């Protein structure tokens, strides 16, 4: 599988 | 009189956490003096997270591209540059809560306190160790990017970790406060895998000493061993080979209890081949490997900050 | 994996810790606004501890008798009064670092964070649960008297515990911020011991749900069980009996993961009867019970 | 064999 950059979302 | 996973009081680090937003991408930032540190991943956009050419994405950004918030207030960025996997956003306001601090690159097996954050706001703090495979068994959800790991010395906060991503192992990878990664990991959404991990032998022994220091010493025996003979049993159980240097790190603990390191190993060797036999050490049934010789000292001597 | 025993950020509590001294006895105190809270034990000398008469001991004291300090600054006490096992000392300064706060009495099974302190200075923070027998398995050295247990809901600190003593069994006893003890214990060095303790069943199921939501699913089975049969088993292994109210609480966690509570009970039952035979559940090798359903929901989504 | 009010 692939890694995940754990950033967020603001809208 | 119970050995729990003590974390450092987190007040001093909480006063350095800020939210950083690039367009619709938001994450956590570390605010020290007139600089904010955060993962460069912030300048990433949703469709460009596989192989983002950072140098290029940064070129099309300006100080106005960054929205740095601390509470309700907005910190005006007046400068930006990249350092390895981190961005150094200069702000016009020097952080009033900056604590005395240092940036230090931690080594495998060592521990630190993590302050898990979301939207620039602190949610929880816990203990973890830098695994031998260079990863950390933590608890981070999306948005945790930017969270930092640290230790404390009298009055100094030693920042040693900034979270970046989660591996398919359900494990995590990050960088030091200089942006250099721990391990062979890169901050892109490609297929990367953690190497096989081993038990931090140094810490298990530290733990055993702690057991002894708290009067729980049924496992001790009358013999001693060699590093060779020990390592031989150790590899069976996937333990980190123990080195002479490790022995010296256990020096203080070994002197406080007066139990030679090789003597403790002989006890551990026996503890591995036989098992606890329903017995418990420090109210535990498993052999703990995430307590450094320092933590043991720290918790048993009620060190304050 | 991806599951840790998380404590709340201690910053807001740190800014309220102070040192209170009376005679030669010293310990921690909570400084909120213009009041300092501390265990009334501070006014007892070694001998007094064997069978103190707090009314008697307090009336012989004046404000001058209390030495409260914030760091290296003597805080002046302009009033004192006793409330159950706590002492409320009035000080002539208001603590600006005072966070939004509430005094709540938690229920056994609930979890909270503890900020271990010595001489009014922070030493470390950890998460723990209020055991069914009202005691707490803490890492409380001595002099930790006065340390507080708390929860943080948004930016509001809910103080729920104030450490008092260590029981001969090795565990700890304390009160709420109103001075009422949690458990049949008293402010006195005498023979004491909490009732029989039990494993917190509600939490273990929340934990197992945490493993499932986090990918782990090996422990599930096709077996079935009724609420009563599950309890008959659980009671054998010293687990708290499970009520309909506990299963309804596990509703959210049930919806998510799509596993019926009774079926999850069917899995735990098998677990209680067959150890884990070398397997680990969410990194652990034993059924963890210091995670409330709320905790789990918070850590896997919040 | 007795409770200890952990004050310093």
CA angle C58, C62, C68 (to 5 degrees): 95
Are C33 and C4 contained in the same domain? no
Side-chain half-sphere exposure of B4, counting CA atoms within 13 A: 28
Q: Judge if B169 and B77 occupy the same domain.
A: no
Angle in degrees, 0-180, between the axes of helices B261-273 and B227-236, rounded to the nearest 10: 30
For the packed helices C261-274 and C227-236, what is the interaxial angle rounded to 10 degrees?
30
Closest-approach residue (CA) in chain A for B42: A7
Q: List CB contacts of C264: < 8 A, sequence separation 6 or more.
A: C205, C208, C209, C220, C250, C254
Nearest CA in chain B to C4: B139
Q: How far is CA C154 from CA B121, B123, C222, C300, in A?
A: 10, 9, 40, 17
Question: How near does any CA of chain B get to the CA of C32, in Å?
Answer: 17
List Cα–Cα distances, B37 to B29, B87, C234, in angstroms: 5, 6, 51
Of the candidates C98, C103, C107, C87, which has an alpha carbon nearest to the alpha carbon of residue C29? C87
Question: From CA B174, how far away is CA B3, in angstroms rounded?
Answer: 28
* DSSP structural state of residue C129: E
Q: Locate C158 and state its tokens.
A: 């809910």
Q: Which of B80, B99, B118 is the last residue of a domain?
A: B99
Clarify whether residues B3 and B118 are in a common domain: yes
Q: Tokens representing B57?
A: 């994405």
* C170 contact residues in B (CB cutoff 8 A): 1-2
Whether residues C176 and C37 fall in one domain: no
Question: Quick one: C185 and C61 in the same domain?
Answer: no
Domain end among B197, B218, B246? B197
Same domain, B2 and B117: yes
Both B291 and B217 in a single domain? yes
Which 119-158 residues of chain C touch chain B by CB within 8 A? 119, 121-128, 137-141, 143-144
CATH number at residue B284: 1.10.1840.10
Within 10 angstroms of residue B237's Cβ, the number of other Cβ atoms is 14
For testing contact with chain A, the best of B17, B19, B25 (most A CBs within 10 A): B25
Method: X-ray
Residue C40 tokens read as 């009334």
Domain tally for chain C?
3
End-to-end CA distance of chain A: 28
Whether B2 sits inside 8 A of C299 (CB atoms) is no
User: For residues D5 and C166, is the Cβ–Cβ distance under 8 A?
Assistant: no
Residue B81 and residue B221 in one domain: no
Q: How far apart are the first and last CA of chain C?
A: 17
Q: List the beta strands (DSSP E) in chain B.
A: 17-22, 25-32, 35-39, 67-70, 73-75, 77-83, 86-91, 101-103, 111-118, 121-129, 148-153, 156-166, 172-175
In which domain, by residue range, is B59 found?
15-99
| Contact: chain D with chain C (3+ CB pairs below 8 Å) | yes
Residues B129 and B268 in one domain: no
Q: Which residues contact B245 (CB under 8 A, 6 or more apart)?
A: none
Q: What is the DSSP letter of C222?
A: S
Q: Compute the C-alpha angle B298/B299/B301, nearest 5°.
A: 70
Same domain for C111 and C95? no
Residues of B in contact with C300 (CB under 8 A): 141
For chain C, what is the largest distance between any 2 Cα atoms, rounded to a whole number of angstroms? 69
Rg, Å, chain A Cα set? 9
Residues B121, B228, single domain; the answer is: no
In terms of DSSP bridges, do strands A4-5 and B156-166 run parallel, antiparallel, or are they unpaired? antiparallel
Question: Diameter of chain A by CA atoms?
Answer: 28
Whether C187 and chain D come into contact, CB under 8 Å, resolves to yes
Dihedrals φ, ψ of C170, to 5°?
100, -10
The total of other beta-carbon atoms located within 10 Å of residue C93's CB is 13
Helix, strand or coil for residue B247?
Answer: helix
B188 vs B164: CA distance, rounded Å: 10
Using alpha carbons, list the distances in angstroms from residue C285 to B9, B111, B205, B243, C279. 28, 22, 20, 29, 7
Of the candidates B127, B283, B304, the beta carbon closest to that of C121 is on B304
Ramachandran category for residue C238: left, alpha or beta (phi over 0 → left; psi -120 to 50 → alpha): left
Q: Structure tokens of B59? A: 């070129």
**CATH code of the domain containing C88:** 2.40.10.10
Indicate if C5 and C36 belong to the same structural domain: no
Which of B44, B75, B99 is the C-terminal boundary of a domain? Answer: B99
**C171 close to B (CB below 8 A):** yes
In this complex, how many residue pairs, one in chain A and one in chain B, have their CB atoms less than 8 Å apart? 70
């Amino acid at each position: 599988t692939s890694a995940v950059l754990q950033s967020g979302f603001r809208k | 009189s119970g050995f729990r996973k003590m974390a450092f009081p987190s007040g001093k680090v909480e006063g350095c956490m800020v939210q950083v937003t690039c367009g619709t991408t938001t994450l956590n930032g570390l605010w020290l003096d007139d600089t904010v540190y955060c993962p460069r991943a912030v300048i990433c956009t949703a469709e460009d997270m596989l192989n983002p050419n950072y140098e290029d994405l940064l070129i099309r950004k300006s100080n106005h591209s960054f929205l740095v918030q601390a509470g309700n207030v907005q910190l005006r960025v007046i400068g930006h540059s990249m350092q390895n996997c981190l961005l150094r956003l200069k702000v016009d306001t020097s952080n009033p809560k900056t604590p005395k601090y240092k940036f230090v690159r931690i080594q495998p097996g060592q521990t630190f306190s993590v302050l898990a954050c979301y939207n620039g706001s602190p949610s929880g703090v816990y203990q973890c160790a830098m695994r031998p495979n260079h990863t950390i068994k933590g608890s981070f959800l999306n948005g945790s990017c930017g969270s930092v790991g640290f230790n404390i010395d009298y009055d100094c906060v030693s920042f040693c970790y900034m979270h970046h991503m989660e591996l398919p192992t359900g494990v995590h990878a990050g960088t030091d406060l200089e942006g250099k990664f721990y391990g062979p990991f890169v901050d892109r959404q490609t297929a990367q895998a953690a190497g096989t991990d081993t038990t931090i032998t140094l810490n298990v022994l530290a733990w055993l000493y702690a057991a002894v220091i708290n009067g729980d010493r049924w496992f001790l025996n009358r013999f001693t061993t060699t590093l060779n003979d020990f390592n031989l049993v150790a590899m069976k159980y996937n333990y980190e080979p123990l080195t002479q240097d490790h022995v010296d790190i256990l020096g203080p603990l070994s002197a406080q209890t007066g139990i030679a390191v090789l003597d403790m190993c002989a006890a551990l060797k026996e503890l591995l081949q036989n098992g606890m036999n329903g017995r418990t050490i420090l109210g535990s049934t498993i052999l703990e490997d995430e307590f450094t010789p320092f933590d043991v000292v720290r918790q048993c001597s009620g060190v304050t900050f």
